[PDB]
From Swiss-Prot:
Keyword Transport annotated: yes
Protein task: Light-driven proton pump.
Lineage: Archaea, Methanobacteriati, Methanobacteriota, Stenosarchaea group, Halobacteria
Assembly and interaction partners: Homotrimer.
Tagged with keyword Cell membrane: yes
PTM remark: The covalent binding of retinal to the apoprotein, bacterioopsin, generates bacteriorhodopsin.
Annotated Gene3D superfamilies: Rhodopsin 7-helix transmembrane proteins
Gene name, Swiss-Prot/TrEMBL: bop
Identification of the protein by name: Bacteriorhodopsin
Cytoplasmic topological segments: 27-40, 94-104, 152-169
Pfam families in the cross-refs: Bac_rhodopsin
Record site: Primary proton acceptor: 82
Keywords per UniProt: Cell membrane, Chromophore, Hydrogen ion transport, Ion transport, Membrane, Photoreceptor protein, Pyrrolidone carboxylic acid, Receptor, Retinal protein, Sensory transduction, Transmembrane, Transmembrane helix, Transport
Subcellular location: Cell membrane
Length: 231
């Protein structure tokens, strides 16, 4: 399984996701506040899922070959199985922080499923030019999510506890910057135009994934915003 040069970044990603999961798991022991328990559960599950899918890519299970451009291209399909479940969970963390209404949560999770689903279809599409049609639709769904996080959540966070408002603003900014890089890496990497080779593309996704999941979680789980206001 070491014949693929990208294996070193899959192994590092597996290890870092695993260590993140164990740290959040141990840190969440003894927490009794029901509000904080919700945030620990959502946030510990995110790196646990990513751990299993990085492991499946490392061992070669989460990889398939897709013919396009007259070549058999290696496509790591396990990323989308990871993102299908972990990106909604991350948006739930943000939505619960600001006490978002139920209709807005459904809009966000539904647009997020369309984003990952069409990205998977584009990844597996065999007609080269059609791959970028799905990329554009997926990116439109992303822009909807980013809009809601700015012109819907930021307006309500400012009317809540100051620790909640400040923590949301930081996590919102982290999320908007990190998530926007994903469509760019896909477009210039092996799934799209093929300008960057697969080993470098895999390194880039690994840095983004660990930052968006473990880095995100470290900021959230250290704030007092996840506990209820109590004496
Ligand atoms: C938190 C502290 C850790 C900070 C870590 C942040 C670093 C992120 C790195 C990124 C991209 C690296 C890209 C390396 C590109 C090498 C490609 C290359 O030069 O190949 C030459 C080619 O053969 C002829 O052009
Ligand atoms: C080397 C280590 C590899 C990485 C570890 C293997 C991960 C796969 C195993 C297990 C699922 C464990 C539980 C995952 C669910 C955690 C949810 C949680 O902790 O919630 C706390 C909440 O407060 C309670 O009500
Ligand atoms: C709050 C919601 C919590 C949700 C928790 C769910 C976490 C599931 C994790 C992992 C395994 C993913 C396995 C995906 C199975 C794919 C198998 C498959 O279809 O392979 C086809 C063929 O055999 C080969 O190409
Ligand atoms: C819209 C309301 C919310 C506002 C939130 C602000 C965040 C905006 C950021 C990004 C979108 C992603 C852009 C990806 C498009 C890159 C395509 C490109 O320019 O590639 C050119 C060429 O192919 C290569 O040299
Ligand atoms: C845990 C990993 C995270 C937060 C992954 C985020 C992934 C995305 C925001 C993916 C976006 C994509 C597009 C908008 C278009 C091209 C295909 C995708 C799926 C990479």
């Amino acid at each position: 399984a070491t014949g693929r040069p990208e294996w070193i970044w899959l192994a590092l990603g597996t290890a870092l996701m695993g260590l993140g999961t164990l740290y959040f798991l141990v840190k969440g022991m003894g927490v009794s506040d029901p509000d904080a328990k919700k945030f620990y559960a959502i946030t510990t599950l995110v790196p646990a899922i990513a751990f299993t899918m990085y492991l499946s890519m490392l061992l070669g299970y989460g990889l398939t070959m897709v013919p396009f451009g007259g070549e058999q291209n290696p496509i790591y399909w396990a990323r989308y199985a990871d993102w299908l479940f972990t990106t909604p969970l991350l948006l739930l963390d943000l939505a619960l922080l600001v006490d978002a209404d139920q209709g807005t949560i459904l809009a966000l999770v539904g647009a997020d499923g369309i984003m990952i689903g069409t990205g998977l279809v584009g990844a597996l599409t065999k007609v080269y030019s059609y791959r970028f049609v799905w990329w554009a639709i997926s990116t439109a769904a992303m822009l909807y999510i980013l809009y809601v996080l700015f012109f819907g959540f930021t307006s309500k966070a400012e009317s809540m506890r100051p620790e909640v408002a400040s923590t949301f603003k930081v996590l919102r900014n982290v999320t908007v910057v990190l998530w926007s890089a994903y469509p760019v890496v896909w477009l210039i990497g092996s799934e799209g135009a093929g300008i960057v080779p697969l080993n470098i593309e895999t390194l880039l996704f690994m840095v983004l994934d660990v930052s968006a999941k473990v880095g995100f979680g470290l900021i959230l789980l250290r704030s007092r915003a996840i506990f209820g206001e109590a004496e």
